[PDB]
Amino acid sequence: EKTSALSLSNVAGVFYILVGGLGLAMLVALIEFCY
Amino acid sequence: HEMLEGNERYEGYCVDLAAEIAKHCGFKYKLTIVGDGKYGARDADTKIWNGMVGELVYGKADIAIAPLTITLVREEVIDFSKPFMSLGISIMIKKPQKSKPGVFSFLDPLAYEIWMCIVFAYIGVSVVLFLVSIFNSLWFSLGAFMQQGSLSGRIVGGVWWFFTLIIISSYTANLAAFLTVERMVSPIESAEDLSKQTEIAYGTLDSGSTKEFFRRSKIAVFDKMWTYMRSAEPSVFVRTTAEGVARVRKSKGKYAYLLESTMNEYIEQRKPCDTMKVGGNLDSKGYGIATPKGSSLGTPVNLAVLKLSEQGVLDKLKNKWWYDKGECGAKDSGSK
Amino acid sequence: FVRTTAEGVARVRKSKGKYAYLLESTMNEYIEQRKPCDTMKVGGNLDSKGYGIATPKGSSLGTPVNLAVLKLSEQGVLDKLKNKWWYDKGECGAKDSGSK
Amino acid sequence: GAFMQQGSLSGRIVGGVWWFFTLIIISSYTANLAAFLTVERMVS
Amino acid sequence: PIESAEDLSKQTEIAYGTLDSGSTKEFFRRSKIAVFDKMWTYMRSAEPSV
Numbered sequence: 072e073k074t075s076a077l078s079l080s081n082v083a084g085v086f087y088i089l090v091g092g093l094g095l096a097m098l099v100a101l102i103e104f105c106y
Numbered sequence: 107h108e109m110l111e112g113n114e115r116y117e118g119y120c121v122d123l124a125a126e127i128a129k130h131c132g133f134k135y136k137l138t139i140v141g142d143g144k145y146g147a148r149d150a151d152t153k154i155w156n157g158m159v160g161e162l163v164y165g166k167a168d169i170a171i172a173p174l175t176i177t178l179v180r181e182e183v184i185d186f187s188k189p190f191m192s193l194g195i196s197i198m199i200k201k202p203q204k205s206k207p208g209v210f211s212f213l214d215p216l217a218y219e220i221w222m223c224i225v226f227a228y229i230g231v232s233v234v235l236f237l238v239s240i241f242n243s244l245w246f247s248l249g250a251f252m253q254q255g256s257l258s259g260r261i262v263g264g265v266w267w268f269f270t271l272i273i274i275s276s277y278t279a280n281l282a283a284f285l286t287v288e289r290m291v292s293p294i295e296s297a298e299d300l301s302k303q304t305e306i307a308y309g310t311l312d313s314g315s316t317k318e319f320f321r322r323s324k325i326a327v328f329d330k331m332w333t334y335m336r337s338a339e340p341s342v343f344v345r346t347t348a349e350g351v352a353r354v355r356k357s358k359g360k361y362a363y364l365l366e367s368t369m370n371e372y373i374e375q376r377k378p379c380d381t382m383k384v385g386g387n388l389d390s391k392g393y394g395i396a397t398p399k400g401s402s403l404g405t406p407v408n409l410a411v412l413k414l415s416e417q418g419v420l421d422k423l424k425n426k427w428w429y430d431k432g433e434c435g436a437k438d439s440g441s442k
Numbered sequence: 443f444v445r446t447t448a449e450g451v452a453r454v455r456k457s458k459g460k461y462a463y464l465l466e467s468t469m470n471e472y473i474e475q476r477k478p479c480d481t482m483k484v485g486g487n488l489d490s491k492g493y494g495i496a497t498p499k500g501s502s503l504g505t506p507v508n509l510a511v512l513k514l515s516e517q518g519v520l521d522k523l524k525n526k527w528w529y530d531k532g533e534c535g536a537k538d539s540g541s542k
Numbered sequence: 543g544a545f546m547q548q549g550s551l552s553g554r555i556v557g558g559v560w561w562f563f564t565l566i567i568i569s570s571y572t573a574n575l576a577a578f579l580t581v582e583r584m585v586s
Numbered sequence: 587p588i589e590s591a592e593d594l595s596k597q598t599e600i601a602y603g604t605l606d607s608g609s610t611k612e613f614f615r616r617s618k619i620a621v622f623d624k625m626w627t628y629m630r631s632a633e634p635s636v
């Protein structure tokens with residue numbers, strides 16, 4: 072009987088693409104303040 | 107029992123039957139307890155009968171009224187009456203589905219680590235909308251959170267929208283899995299399906315009519331059960347009937363016991379009402395009233411037993427000491 | 443109430459699940475294993491009866507046949523024979539009802 | 543008019559916790575609907 | 587069905603049968619195995635003729 076449950080090791084795959092977008096969001100914010 | 111004396115000393119099914127037998131024949135009886143027990147068996151070496159059946163062949167008693175198995179070895183030495191109570195080998199397991207509701211299960215599929223990890227991403231995006239654009243910016247970032255998600259702020263809501271989309275889908279997807287897997291359950295399966303899996307163990311009594319049934323049985327379903335229990339380690343057998351009842355209660359629903367339907371139905375109706383008979387009987391057998399051969403009581407007693415079955419008496423006496431006087435009277439009608 | 447046992451079975455098949463019938467378990471179990479496999483035995487039996495082999499009184503064949511029947515039960519013959527003509531010979535298999 | 547499209551600072555936490563509540567039901571509505579379309583049980 | 591002989595015996599949607607006169611048919615007949623005897627009883631009484 073599963074009881075397959077949810078894997079935190081695979082949920083992190085989208086937590087890394089999000090913070091990657093947050094890091095890209097800080098790079099585009101600075102070029103808007105200069106021009 | 108100390109203050110009284112005579113036939114009133116004892117009470118039970120056969121006790122009530124003893125009178126109903128005597129009423130349709132007319133004889134002054136006396137309820138004697140067998141001095142040794144063991145119903146009725148024959149020794150291998152000496153070949154001397156013992157128990158209730160023996161006290162009929164040797165003339166020490168005049169009739170044997172009890173839950174006496176109608177076997178061939180006993181029919182050769184005593185005249186049995188027709189069955190007053192049909193029965194068979196059955197199954198006994200614990201009461202399933204004992205758990206579990208509550209708000210602690212409200213955070214189960216998404217594991218304990220993810221409900222505390224989703225909150226790190228919410229405040230991490232409500233603090234970036236603080237920068238790309240304290241009381242109205244958190245209200246503006248929360249106003250963008252409920253509705254999904256400058257060039258700097260558009261890619262924040264674009265990437266957050268992907269992230270929140272994945273979690274609600276992996277949440278809904280896994281939530282169907284625990285409901286599809288729940289929708290299998292046995293629950294409550296038949297005697298053949300008990301043999302197919304080896305997660306829940308099963309066994310019988312170590313020395314009795316129940317074990318020998320599986321021994322020389324040439325049926326595939328029952329031979330497969332026999333070859334399993336014979337090689338089963340640790341030992342699935344038990345010494346006495348009291349142990350087999352107790353072992354099912356303390357196995358967390360991971361052990362079963364096989365026994366006659368009469369003794370199975372009776373434990374279902376006694377505290378703490380955690381046992382249950384499941385499935386149908388395995389073989390055909392019944393109890394009978396034994397008499398000495400050639401005795402004048404014979405055919406009249408046999409005729410009387412047929413009279414009690416068709417008038418609805420033996421069905422009523424069955425219900426009386428099982429269900430009516432039973433301590434789990436409420437656990438029978440509403441158990442399904 | 444119906445006239446024959448034949449009308450009792452057919453009436454259940456045309457009642458759209460709003461009529462039941464009561465009969466001996468043997469016949470009911472057998473009908474359960476015959477096409478088009480739409481009937482079913484539910485719940486336990488209501489009373490304790492059985493079938494027997496009848497012999498004229500005082501006949502020589504009396505005592506032996508009675509003893510012989512007890513030998514068949516304890517040799518798993520009667521259970522096998524019933525399993526052979528009810529379920530084995532049946533058209534709706536016993537495994538057909540166990541998730542197929 | 544704020545209920546159909548999901549869900550000031552006092553009116554934002556109202557539309558946020560409501561959005562979280564209705565998200566659970568619509569998901570638990572869909573997840574259970576799939577389970578009863580996969581395994582058909584027969585009620586006696 | 588999964589590739590196995592016991593999985594073929596456990597269901598009766600997809601039917602099965604052998605040759606009318608050959609060693610193939612006689613094997614199932616006198617076989618005293620649990621898996622094969624069930625296949626024999628089915629083919630012996632399957633209607634119409636498999």
Ligand SMILES: CCN(CC)Cc1cccc(CCc2nc3ccc(F)cc3c(=O)n2-c2ccccc2Cl)n1
Nearest residue numbers: 074205206207211212213214215216281284288566570
């Ligand atoms: C019923 C026996 N359960 C074992 C405790 C099986 C099981 C195991 C793991 C997970 C579950 C479903 C748990 C569950 N998680 C939720 C997560 C978020 C949310 F908003 C709601 C739920 C939720 O209602 N459940 C739940 C709990 C009990 C019964 C039904 C459900 Cl859907 N059930």
